[PDB]
């Protein structure tokens, strides 16, 4: 055990060393980006040793190495959890981050602040490990809110761009609503179970868990960008491409899904929550998949692809398969990150041109990015025996052979068809055909940083699922017997998508005219949710703050009913008692009145 | 960003290289000062396509308030060199 503990915490400490050494400037600049990459590289291999110890002996432990606060009967201590989810996810996060940072050393070479950029990437990675490794809600909330800020700082990287600040603040807004659910979960646990540690919560096993679980579901909604709080993720693509690959593709958006996985001992007994989670994901995995069928910007297509995958992860939690949802997180990290790097490689070649309508003929020009792009798409769609097959197909198998909502089941299958459409849309509009990019372009991809960074993920996006699948300890009863037409639903669904997608592309090249429709403009405009909500809600709330809250009340009616009326009255009485001519004839008559009144009305003389 | 910096000669050569591929101008008489309208008898509706063939070459939009003002392939060269920060 002494080795399991020491190597687990050194992984977290190692990542923090570059931050500490950048506080007192005890290093040499212009090598910092390579300094950070090496720390991630070494952090990865160290994390494997605890992982192997888990794979071998199934050994887990909890470390409470500090006593921070004690609120009467509540004790808050810095605790770390090293179990199935912690040990499995950490190596993948480091492995993908390793590749992303090496790519960044190429992609962001000309950026003046490339030093600060790497520090921010490292800071997010640290907070994501706090979130994943947290053993109590308060410690979980530290990472939960930390990643949201690092998302704010990296999205708004080019702060001169008005639209980067709007996208950055928008991400904070939507997540803050989710945090409302997180707080509700924390408040309910304290008053009902008198704890925040996950050890005591599971031991007591509450029965009336509808309220806290709804809170956690709401928190998972905002962070994973499900329907209702979806719009921010597609708009998070304002940030530099390396940020998109790491945070908003593989290792931040999954945090919402991850939170619901850690509470599976509760949701397993609460079918009502399983109903909402199943339905909430089903609408997202279909609506977002629908939006991608017509997007032109290359990053936004992958951004919506991420949302659809996230929805499918929530459906899996909804159908009471917590481990399969986690298995999709691990696999999804590999190939989803690769597509962004492949896309980023294309964008730089064509001089910051992100529109697929202005690309093409790159199948032969960029063979390495082409092969990487192809391998990723086949992994995403669920090509057999790749990384995405060992998790996505098991998910579709478990959905059909389960007591599941019929409509939610249908949306998952339809959305799978759309997976093969926009994927083909990128391949067809970015590799085949004839060039549409400008005449003078330097299509070069020979930088060793680019190849080696991708070449590490290309290996992962092939045998990542195969290895993890055959090594994780069993935790369920897999449903391996079912009708043939269900066992091969995804294959037929996916293959029909390619064929249906293939024909749609060819009809474009014909010289027929174009007829706009109400289904093309509905998907192109994201369903109208951003156009309406981002204009209506800000207008209503902002106007109220001025007309009602600020002017009507504070500047008018709170002044009128106390400072003003009280003050005005004294001024009025001040004129009455001082509007005196100065005549003896009239003063002394008052004295006569006072004496008479003192005896008749008041009887002061007796 | 790893691209080759533009040059005054490079701008001029490419600008004329686009015009040489347009069927409504004779390459023989095409000089830097050949006014598109008076010296070549091209209607304004052609001039619009001329500019559109340039901004698709250098890949940067030119506002209409200024594009219509360009009536000489030297002005296009001067306009781009001034808007791309080229001096030699």
């Amino acid at each position: 055990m002494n080795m399991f503990s020491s190597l687990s915490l050194v992984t977290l400490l190692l990542l923090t060393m570059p931050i500490m050494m950048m506080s007192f400037n005890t290093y040499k600049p212009s090598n910092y980006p390579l300094y950070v990459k090496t720390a991630i590289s070494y952090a990865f291999i160290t994390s494997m040793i605890p992982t192997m110890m888990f794979i071998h002996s199934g050994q887990e432990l909890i470390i409470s190495n500090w006593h921070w606060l004690t609120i009467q009967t509540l004790k808050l201590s810095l605790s770390f959890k090293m179990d199935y989810f912690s040990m499995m996810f950490i190596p993948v996060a480091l492995f993908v981050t390793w590749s992303i940072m090496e790519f960044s050393m190429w992609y962001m070479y000309s950026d003046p602040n490339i030093n600060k950029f790497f520090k921010y990437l490292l800071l997010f990675l640290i907070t994501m490990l706090i979130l994943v490794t947290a053993n109590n809600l308060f410690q979980l909330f530290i990472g939960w809110e930390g990643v949201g800020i690092m998302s704010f700082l990296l999205i708004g990287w080019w702060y001169g761009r008005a639209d980067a600040n709007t996208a950055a603040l928008q991400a904070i807004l939507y997540n803050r609503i989710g945090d409302i659910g997180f707080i509700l979960a924390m408040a309910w646990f304290l008053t009902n179970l008198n704890t925040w540690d996950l050890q005591q919560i599971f031991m007591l096993n509450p029965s009336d868990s509808n309220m806290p679980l709804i809170g956690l579901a709401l928190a998972a909604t905002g962070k994973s960008a499900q329907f209702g709080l979806h719009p921010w993720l597609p708009s998070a693509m304002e940030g530099p491409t390396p940020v998109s690959a790491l945070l908003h593709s593989s290792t931040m958006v999954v945090a919402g899904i991850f939170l619901l996985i850690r509470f599976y001992p509760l949701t397993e007994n609460n079918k009502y929550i399983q109903s909402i989670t199943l339905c909430l994901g089903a609408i997202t995995t279909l609506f977002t998949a629908m939006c991608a069928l017509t997007q032109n910007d290359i990053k936004k297509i992958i951004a919506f692809s991420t949302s659809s995958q996230l929805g499918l992860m929530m459906v899996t939690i909804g159908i009471n398969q917590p481990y399969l949802a986690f298995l999709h997180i691990c696999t999804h990290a590999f190939f989803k990150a690769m597509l962004f790097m492949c896309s980023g490689s294309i964008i730089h070649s064509l001089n910051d041109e992100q529109d697929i309508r202005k690309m093409g003929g790159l199948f032969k020009a960029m063979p390495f990015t082409t092969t990487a792009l192809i391998v990723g798409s086949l992994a995403l769609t669920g090509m057999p025996f790749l990384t995405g097959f060992y998790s996505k197909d098991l998910i579709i198998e478990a959905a059909n052979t389960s007591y599941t909502n019929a409509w939610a089941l249908l949306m998952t299958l339809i959305a799978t068809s759309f997976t093969a459409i926009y994927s083909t849309r990128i391949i067809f509009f970015a590799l085949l055909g004839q060039p549409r990019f400008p005449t003078l372009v330097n299509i070069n991809e020979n930088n060793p940083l680019l190849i080696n960074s991708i070449k590490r993920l290309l290996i992962g996006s092939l045998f990542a699922g195969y290895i993890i699948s055959n090594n994780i300890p069993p935790t369920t009863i897999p449903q391996m017997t079912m009708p043939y037409y269900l066992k091969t639903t995804a294959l037929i669904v996916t293959i029909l998508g390619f064929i249906l997608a293939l024909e749609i592309s060819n009809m474009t090249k014909n010289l027929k005219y174009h007829y706009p429709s109400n289904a093309f403009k509905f998907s192109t405009l994201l369903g109208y949710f951003p156009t309406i909500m981002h204009r209506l809600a800000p207008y209503m709330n902002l106007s109220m703050s001025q007309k009602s809250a600020s002017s009507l009340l504070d500047l008018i009616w709170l002044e009128a009913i106390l400072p003003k009326t009280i003050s005005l009255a004294q001024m009025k009485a001040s004129t009455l008692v001082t509007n005196q001519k100065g005549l003896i004839k009239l003063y002394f008559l008052s004295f006569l009145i006072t004496i008479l009144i003192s005896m008749i009305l008041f009887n002061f003389h007796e | 960003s790893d691209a080759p910096p533009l040059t005054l000669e490079g701008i001029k050569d490419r600008v004329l290289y686009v015009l040489k591929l347009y069927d409504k101008i004779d390459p023989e008489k095409l000089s830097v000062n050949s006014h598109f309208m008076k010296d070549l008898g091209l209607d304004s509706l052609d001039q619009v396509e001329i500019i559109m063939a340039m901004e698709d070459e250098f890949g940067f939009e030119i506002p209409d308030i200024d594009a219509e003002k360009l009536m000489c392939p030297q002005e296009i060269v001067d306009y781009i060199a001034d808007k791309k920060d080229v001096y030699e």
Binding site: L440, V441, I443, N447 | -
Partner: peptide
């Protein structure tokens, strides 16, 4: 951006490959 081999750009031609 920086490092590795160097490929001279070409105009209206298939880019040079290694």
């Amino acid at each position: 951006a920086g490092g590795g081999a160097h490929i001279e750009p070409r105009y209206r031609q298939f880019p040079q490959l290694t």
